Structures are given as structure tokens and as C-alpha cells.
């Protein structure tokens, strides 16, 4: 009875029971998300509870198979994921306190209101609508400081205790702290030179930031000059951007600054929604077009049970539904897409995005249950986003008859498009890096409690080039005012998945022998590109993510140079546009100073 065979026998018993309990949990959850009734909440809770109860019990049996003694790395990975106790390593009382803490912060976030000089706005949609659309300095300031002084202040004492119990949980799971526990998602232990330590993620993420800083500084300088036009009495040409003028409640994306920053305001964006309606497209036509695109690159078509079981429109009966687009991998070769699709270019691109998740789910469906996931937390969205990249290009829209055969995209709308992309993609990278770096150092104890707000805004000025419009002491908890922080979600997933998606695109575009700028690339009708991609998709998480990445792009390394190549036409445009502007920022200046 060798160690490999005992644990494989255990995994065989686990897999045969997990597939049923996980399916019943997914099916009940599906029946709620597509039929919102009080009856189906309880079924979803009971089905979810018996699946959670089962996994907890199997996780404790699984810990008796020491990883060191297993020769089989495929077996070793399965036991590893199953052995990860998480919050179950805490005492039952301490896990219940943390659950109460996490449920109170989440409740405070979604019920928080801000009352002006009785009528109060929630975040959704009141305070949001102001932060994404208002061009008035003082109205955005009232919403920005109001959200952080009413909601964030409530979260300050709860988040302090949230850190204690999370670090205690991670220490019980034999990690440095909660931050080092999160970085374990990128830990590869495999063959020679595919190794990836949790501490190496810190150096990669920091190194990638230094390579990005020049492009970000030029986008930052261009946005600063354009904001100086609209807020002439509040903006400094060499200072950080006021945190409340960035296009949303936190400045995560700069997308909503496009009306203030569009390089050529008379050039409209290419919107093919009218062409879709003019041709009597409906939601079945949309997902049929998405299916043909994946078949064009050599990926399989949808199963018949996909078309029967999916919810591709908002139901025409009276049942209430969650309309947020999701791709469901329920198990047992049951793949579905839940989507309240409308006949628009936006939902046309979303259909390719969600079906990209489906292709990924179908590819690794023959893997053992515990290995059916992305290589790491950033692979699934990276794969889904490159499909909408190809489908959104005018070349592809012309080839499916949605753009006129005459159509020629001029340079101005090409620059308009790249600028719009950079507000979302490039603008969010320093924000994402600095946020998770602050959480990593708060969990590690490098940032003491009495300097949380001091360090948060010292790193905002330093890394993001963003300054607070109002001085905040330690009664505030400003990061907690973001959904992902208040709801206990790791954030570096948005950093890495952005790096991955442009490595994938550049690799697949070279395989398709595309010629021209990378942003005009359409991988349609290239079977070798989809075949190259599938060699990674079918791996699941059965191999080190570095090896899975190398099977597509040829490199074991998370590389940002592909993203820089994608935005090189814009960087060339920005350096000329910023010729009379200051590139960089000083961390000293404050709008309140």
C-alpha cells in the first residue's frame, strides 16, 4: 500500500461523491438565479449547506495524506486544494465571530446612505451616478467624502477585528498572514524552473509596475491637463489628481473621464447596435454568432444541453431573475449561460466573453473534479476578455456583415479607441497594485493600525499619483469603502489577468500570422491559434500555471511587454500630446494643503 495509491483511492471516492453534491448545489443555485422566490432561497441554502458540510469533512480526512510522500504531482495537487482548510482551521467560536464581522461589513456597505444639507442617496445608484457623470467639483466632493465618513468610519473598527481573525486563520493554515495566504493561489511547485513562490509574486508585481510607470505617467499627464480645463481652479499641473475627480467613487477605472479626455471629440465610436437591429437580430442570433467565432478558431460548438438549459433572455413569463451575465459550469457536462441579453453591441461582445468562459470549462471537463479551474485566479477572465477583443475589431465586424464592406477605420477613431481602452485597462493597474500592496502590508503588520490612513494616502500619492481632497485621520477606513475590501475579495486578480490577457492575444495573433498593430488583430478563422490556446485550456489547474502559460505564449513568466506593445501607438501619440505638459507628479501638493 504505497502512499500514492491510498490517496488516489481516497480521491476516487471523493470525486464520485463530490460530483453529485456539487451538481445539486449548482442546480439549486441556478434555480434561484433564474427564478427568484422565497421557496428557492431555502433550497439553495440547504443544497449549499450539505455541499459545504461534505467538503469540510473531506478536507479533514484529506489532511492525513502528507503531501511530501506523494510522487504523483497530479495527485499531489488534488490533495493540496482539498487540504486547504481556510476558515475551518479556526475554532468554531472564532469562525462564527469572523462570519458575523464579514456579514456586518457587507451589510453596512450595501445599506450605507449619505444625507446632504432627509433625502439620502445609496451607493447604487445615487452616489454612483454622481461619481461617474458629474463634472462639478463640489458635488463630487460631497459624495466622495460623504461615502467615506459615513460608511468607511463604520467599517473602521470592524475591519481592525477582521484583520486579527484573518491573520489567525492564515497562521493556523501555516502562512505568514492573510496576505501571504492569498498569494498562495500563485504558488507553483512543479518541474525544474516552473517553480513560483508566494514571495516572488511580490517582486513580479512590483517589477511589472516599474515597466508600466512610463506609460501610466503619460496617460496621467494627459488626463491631468484635460481635467485642468474642466476644473481650472482646483487642479495643479505637477500635482496628483484629486481622488474624487477620477470617474467613479474610488478612481478604480478612468473610463468615465472619456467625455473630458477624448482625443477627437467629433469622431463617434463605432457602435454596430443599429446594424444588428436593422438586420432583425435577436439573442439566439447573437450567441449563434459567438458559436461560429469559436468554431472558426477550431474550438468545439456548444452542446445541445447548453441551448436547452441556458437563459439567454429575460424570461417572458413573470419570474424574477438575476441579470448579471455569468457562465455556469455545473458539472456532468452541463454548461449554461445566464444572461438577460438585449440586441446591442455591448451584449454582443459580452456573449463572446461569457462563451469564452464556457470553452474553458468544456476543455478541462475531463480533468478530475478538483483540477477543473483556471491555471490561477487570473486565467479565466483573461481567456474570456481576449475573445471580446477580437470580436470588437472593425475587421471582424466587417466580416460578419455588421460593418459596411466600404468601411475604413481612420486614425482618429483608432486613437479614440486606444485612449478609451487605456482609461480602463492602464488606469486601473496602479490603483489595483497599490490597493493590494496596502492590504498585504496591513496583514503583514508593516503598516501599524495608527498609521493605516497615513500610509494609504502616502501610497496613493506615491504609486497612483492620486491625492485626497480632504485630510483623513485614523477614524476613517477609506479602502473599506470599496466593495472588494468590505466583502473580503482578493484584488491582485485584476492585475495579473490584465497581464495575462495581452500575453495570450499577442501569442495567438502571432500564431495567426497577423500583420499590423496588435490592437487591430482578429484571431478569427485561425484554427492553429485556437488549438494553441486549447493546449492550455484543457490543463485546468493540473499543471503549474507557469507551464500552462508557457504552452501558449512560449514564456514561463508573467510578462507585461505584450500590453506595452498593444498601447505603443497610444504612447507615441501621448508623448507628442504631452510635449508642453509635465510628465510625473509631486507627492507634496494637496487641494486642501
Amino acid at each position: 500500500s504505497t502512499s500514492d495509491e491510498e490517496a488516489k483511492t481516497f480521491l476516487e471516492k471523493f470525486n464520485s461523491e463530490a460530483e453529485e453534491l456539487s451538481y445539486q448545489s449548482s442546480l439549486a443555485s441556478w434555480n434561484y438565479n433564474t427564478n427568484i422566490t422565497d421557496e428557492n432561497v431555502q433550497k439553495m441554502n440547504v443544497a449549499g449547506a450539505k455541499w459545504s458540510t461534505f467538503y469540510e469533512e473531506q478536507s479533514k480526512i484529506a489532511k492525513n495524506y502528507q503531501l511530501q510522500n506523494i510522487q504523483n504531482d497530479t495527485i499531489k495537487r488534488q490533495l493540496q486544494a482539498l487540504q486547504l482548510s481556510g476558515s475551518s482551521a479556526l475554532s468554531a467560536d472564532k469562525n462564527q465571530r469572523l462570519n458575523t464581522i464579514l456579514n456586518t461589513m457587507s451589510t453596512i456597505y450595501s445599506t450605507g446612505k449619505v444625507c446632504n444639507p432627509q433625502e439620502c442617496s445609496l451607493l447604487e445608484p445615487g452616489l454612483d451616478n454622481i461619481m461617474e457623470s458629474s463634472k462639478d467639483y463640489n458635488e463630487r466632493l460631497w459624495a466622495w467624502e460623504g461615502w467615506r465618513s459615513e460608511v468607511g468610519k463604520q467599517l473602521r473598527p470592524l475591519y481592525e477585528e477582521y484583520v486579527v481573525l484573518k491573520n489567525e486563520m492564515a497562521r493556523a493554515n501555516h502562512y505568514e498572514d492573510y496576505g501571504d495566504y492569498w498569494r498562495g493561489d500563485y504558488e507553483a511547485e512543479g518541474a525544474n524552473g516552473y517553480n513560483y513562490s508566494r514571495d516572488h509574486l511580490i517582486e513580479d508585481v512590483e517589477h511589472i509596475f516599474t515597466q508600466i510607470k512610463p506609460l501610466y505617467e503619460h496617460l496621467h499627464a494627459y488626463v491631468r491637463a484635460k481635467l485642468m480645463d474642466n476644473y481650472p481652479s482646483h487642479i495643479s499641473p505637477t500635482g496628483c489628481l484629486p481622488a474624487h475627480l477620477l470617474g467613479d467613487m474610488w478612481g478604480r477605472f478612468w473610463t468615465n473621464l472619456y467625455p473630458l479626455t477624448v482625443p477627437f471629440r467629433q469622431k463617434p465610436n463605432i457602435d454596430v447596435t443599429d446594424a444588428m437591429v436593422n438586420q432583425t437580430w435577436d439573442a439566439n442570433r447573437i450567441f449563434k454568432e459567438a458559436e461560429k467565432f469559436f468554431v472558426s478558431v477550431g474550438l468545439p460548438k456548444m452542446t445541445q444541453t447548453f441551448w436547452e438549459n441556458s437563459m439567454l433572455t429575460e424570461p417572458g413569463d413573470g419570474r424574477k431573475v438575476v441579470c448579471h451575465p455569468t457562465a455556469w459550469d455545473l458539472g456532468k457536462h452541463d454548461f449554461r449561460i445566464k444572461m438577460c441579453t438585449k440586441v446591442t453591441m455591448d451584449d454582443f461582445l459580452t456573449a463572446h466573453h461569457e462563451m469564452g468562459h464556457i470553452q474553458y470549462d468544456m476543455a478541462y471537463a475531463m480533468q478530475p473534479y478538483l483540477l477543473r479551474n483556471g491555471a490561477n485566479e487570473g486565467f479565466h477572465e483573461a481567456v474570456g476578455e481576449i475573445m471580446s477583443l477580437s470580436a470588437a475589431t472593425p475587421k471582424h465586424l466587417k466580416n460578419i456583415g455588421l460593418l459596411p464592406p466600404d468601411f475604413y477605420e481612420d486614425n482618429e477613431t483608432e486613437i479614440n479607441f486606444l485612449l478609451k481602452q487605456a482609461l480602463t485597462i492602464v488606469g486601473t493597474l496602479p490603483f489595483t497594485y497599490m490597493l493590494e500592496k496596502w492590504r498585504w502590508m496591513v496583514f503583514s503588520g508593516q503598516i501599524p493600525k495608527e498609521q493605516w490612513m497615513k500610509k494609504w494616502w502616502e501610497m496613493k500619492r506615491e504609486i497612483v499619483g492620486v491625492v485626497e481632497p480632504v485630510p483623513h485621520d485614523e477614524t476613517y477606513c477609506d479602502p473599506a469603502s470599496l466593495f472588494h475590501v468590505a466583502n473580503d475579495y482578493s484584488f491582485i486578480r485584476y492585475y495579473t489577468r490584465t497581464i495575462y490577457q495581452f500575453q495570450f492575444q499577442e501569442a495567438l495573433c502571432q500564431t495567426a500570422k497577423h500583420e499590423g498593430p496588435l490592437h487591430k488583430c482578429d484571431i478569427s478563422n485561425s484554427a492553429e491559434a485556437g488549438q494553441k490556446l486549447l493546449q492550455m485550456l484543457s490543463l485546468g489547474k493540473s499543471k503549474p500555471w507557469t507551464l500552462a502559460l508557457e504552452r501558449v505564449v512560449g514564456t514561463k513568466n508573467m510578462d507585461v511587454r505584450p500590453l506595452l506593445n498593444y498601447f505603443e501607438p497610444l504612447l507615441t501619440w501621448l508623448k507628442e500630446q504631452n510635449k508642453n505638459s509635465f510628465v510625473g507628479w509631486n507627492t507634496d501638493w494637496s487641494p486642501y494643503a
Binding site: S16, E20, Q24, L27
Partner: protein
């Protein structure tokens, strides 16, 4: 003109579990095999040793009808020279098999909302089955070195596992009803001709 009772095997309300597969001996009757091999209701009709069109022009001593239920991706295991959980531990065909293997999707009968769990299969066994061997024991499987003493526990497993058949499953996980027909030829009466 005693007709062979194939409707009893093919149209039975219930089907047996694969680990306890059923066997019906067909003898002393006339079989019209064209009734079966000319039917489009069978997704699998694979013969070994014999040719379908020649079955009516043939005689055998006995004919055995084995029947059970497995999921779709396991029908390929019901064939000579296959490996897998079903072929090794539940139902094994000999390499020199003489007969036909018939299967058809039964999602409409054997699947149920919430899940049908009557059909079972043998998950563990110390050794492979010899051809046409039937194992219906329920002894606790000892996966380690400490004896189980008939107690489920660490490295000690109950050897049978249930299928879960929901009607929304993919085709590979849907239930399929299988009928294996064995044609035996001894130096003997040869009572089943069947024009």
C-alpha cells in the same frame, strides 16, 4: 413458432444495476433478429464474431441476454479488450466474444428531477473480473494496510457507489440501457435457430 421473449429483456420496466447485471437465458424459440438490428432506436448496435444480416440464417444452442444501466461515456467499455471501472469491476467481455452489444439512451425513463440513485456500480475491487464474472459482494474495501473488520473508515471504503441521473445532465452522464447478446455453440441440440 414459439417466439423468443426479447420484449421481456428490451421492454422491462426496470433494469438491473451493472454490478448486479441481469442475465436471461433464451432457448427453444424462433428469433427474428431483424426486428432489433433494423431499429433506429438503438444508438449502439455492435456485433462481434457474427454479422447482423446473417443472424436470421444461423442456429445456436443457447442465447444469453445480459442487461444493465450505465452512463453514456461508459458504453464504450462494453466491448472486447476494454479497460475502465465498468469493464474491470462490473462487467467484462472476453476477447474472443461472440455476440452483439446494444445500447440506447434512457434519460426519459431512468433520470429524475432531484436525481435517481437506484442504479449502482462497483467502484473498488482487489482484482479484475474474469469474462462474464458477476460480483455482488458488499465487503468493505481495504485500501490501506490496517484491516477494516467490516467497518467503513480511513482507507476503508464501501465498494459500491450510486449513479446520479438528473435529466439535465450532459449526454455522457445520462443513463443508457445496455443489452449484451451472447450466442453459444456447443456440440449440442442447437435449439435456437430463428428464421
Amino acid at each position: 413458432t414459439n417466439l423468443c421473449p426479447f420484449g421481456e429483456v428490451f421492454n422491462a420496466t426496470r433494469f438491473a444495476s451493472v454490478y448486479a447485471w441481469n442475465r436471461k437465458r433464451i432457448s427453444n424459440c424462433v428469433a427474428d433478429y431483424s426486428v432489433l438490428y433494423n431499429s433506429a432506436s438503438f444508438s449502439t448496435f455492435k456485433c462481434y464474431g457474427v454479422s447482423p444480416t446473417k443472424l436470421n440464417d444461423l442456429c445456436f444452442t443457447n442465447v444469453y441476454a445480459d442487461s444493465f444501466v450505465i452512463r453514456g461515456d461508459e458504453v464504450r467499455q462494453i466491448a472486447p479488450g476494454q479497460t475502465g471501472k465498468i469493464a474491470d469491476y462490473n462487467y467484462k467481455l472476453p476477447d474472443d466474444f461472440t455476440g452483439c452489444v446494444i445500447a440506447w439512451n434512457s434519460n426519459n425513463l431512468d433520470s429524475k428531477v432531484g436525481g435517481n440513485y437506484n442504479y449502482l456500480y462497483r467502484l473498488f475491487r482487489k482484482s479484475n473480473l474474469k469474462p462474464f464474472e458477476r460480483d455482488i459482494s458488499t465487503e468493505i474495501y481495504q485500501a490501506g494496510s490496517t484491516p477494516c473488520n467490516g467497518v467503513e473508515g480511513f482507507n476503508c471504503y464501501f465498494p459500491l457507489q450510486s449513479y446520479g441521473f438528473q435529466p439535465t445532465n450532459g449526454v455522457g452522464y445520462q443513463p443508457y440501457r445496455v443489452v449484451v447478446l451472447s450466442f453459444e455453440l456447443l456440440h449440442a441440440p442447437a435449439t435456437v435457430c430463428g428464421p
